[PDB]
Coordinates of C-alpha atoms in Angstrom, one line a residue:
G1 CA 217.3 114.1 217.0
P2 CA 216.1 112.2 213.8
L3 CA 218.9 112.7 211.2
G4 CA 219.3 110.8 207.8
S5 CA 220.9 111.9 204.4
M6 CA 223.7 111.1 202.0
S7 CA 222.4 112.6 198.6
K8 CA 220.0 114.8 197.7
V9 CA 219.2 117.1 194.5
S10 CA 216.8 119.8 193.5
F11 CA 214.1 118.6 190.6
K12 CA 212.3 121.3 188.3
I13 CA 208.9 120.5 187.2
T14 CA 207.3 122.9 185.5
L15 CA 203.5 122.2 184.6
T16 CA 203.0 125.3 182.4
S17 CA 206.4 127.1 182.4
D18 CA 204.5 130.0 180.9
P19 CA 205.7 133.6 181.6
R20 CA 202.7 134.7 183.3
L21 CA 203.1 132.3 186.5
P22 CA 206.3 131.2 188.0
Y23 CA 207.6 127.4 187.8
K24 CA 207.4 124.5 189.8
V25 CA 210.4 123.5 191.6
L26 CA 210.7 120.9 194.3
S27 CA 213.7 119.0 196.0
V28 CA 214.1 115.2 196.2
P29 CA 216.9 112.5 196.6
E30 CA 218.3 110.6 194.1
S31 CA 217.1 107.1 195.3
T32 CA 213.2 107.8 194.8
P33 CA 210.8 106.6 191.8
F34 CA 210.7 109.6 189.5
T35 CA 207.5 108.7 187.9
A36 CA 205.7 108.4 191.1
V37 CA 207.0 111.7 192.6
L38 CA 206.2 113.4 189.3
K39 CA 203.2 112.1 188.6
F40 CA 202.3 112.8 192.2
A41 CA 202.7 116.6 192.4
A42 CA 202.0 117.0 188.8
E43 CA 198.5 115.6 189.5
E44 CA 198.0 118.3 191.8
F45 CA 199.4 120.8 189.3
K46 CA 196.5 120.2 186.8
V47 CA 199.4 118.0 184.7
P48 CA 198.6 114.5 184.8
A49 CA 201.0 111.7 183.8
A50 CA 198.4 108.9 182.9
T51 CA 197.1 110.5 179.8
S52 CA 199.7 113.2 179.5
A53 CA 203.3 112.9 178.9
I54 CA 206.9 114.5 180.5
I55 CA 209.5 116.0 178.6
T56 CA 212.4 118.4 179.2
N57 CA 212.7 121.8 178.2
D58 CA 214.0 120.7 174.6
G59 CA 211.5 117.8 174.8
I60 CA 213.1 114.5 175.3
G61 CA 211.6 111.1 176.6
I62 CA 212.4 110.0 179.8
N63 CA 212.7 106.5 181.3
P64 CA 210.2 106.0 184.4
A65 CA 212.2 102.8 185.3
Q66 CA 214.6 104.9 186.7
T67 CA 215.4 106.9 189.9
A68 CA 215.2 110.7 190.6
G69 CA 219.0 110.6 190.3
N70 CA 219.4 108.8 187.0
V71 CA 216.7 111.3 185.5
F72 CA 218.4 114.2 187.3
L73 CA 221.6 113.5 185.7
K74 CA 220.5 112.3 182.0
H75 CA 218.3 115.3 181.8
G76 CA 219.7 117.7 184.5
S77 CA 216.6 119.2 186.4
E78 CA 214.9 121.3 184.1
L79 CA 211.6 119.6 183.2
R80 CA 208.1 119.8 182.1
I81 CA 204.7 118.1 181.8
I82 CA 202.2 118.2 179.1
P83 CA 199.6 116.2 177.3
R84 CA 200.6 114.3 174.2
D85 CA 197.2 113.3 172.7
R86 CA 193.9 114.0 173.4
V87 CA 190.4 112.3 172.7
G88 CA 187.5 113.8 174.7

């Protein structure tokens, strides 16, 4: 009976957040690499983080040097990912 918890939260990461299809919302703890988790799932959501950027519903910068908790508190939970520039 393996058990281990203390703090959890539901993070919302929309790759398109379009009206056609639904949004992408997952659940993760506060003590975790926000950037990692984001770029991780986002990478599989046709929304990379290497060349693309991440912003909230309103569109604000985020510090990837923080944990899911810090990013979940500052912003809240509703966040989307999209490209900032293009070259090829």
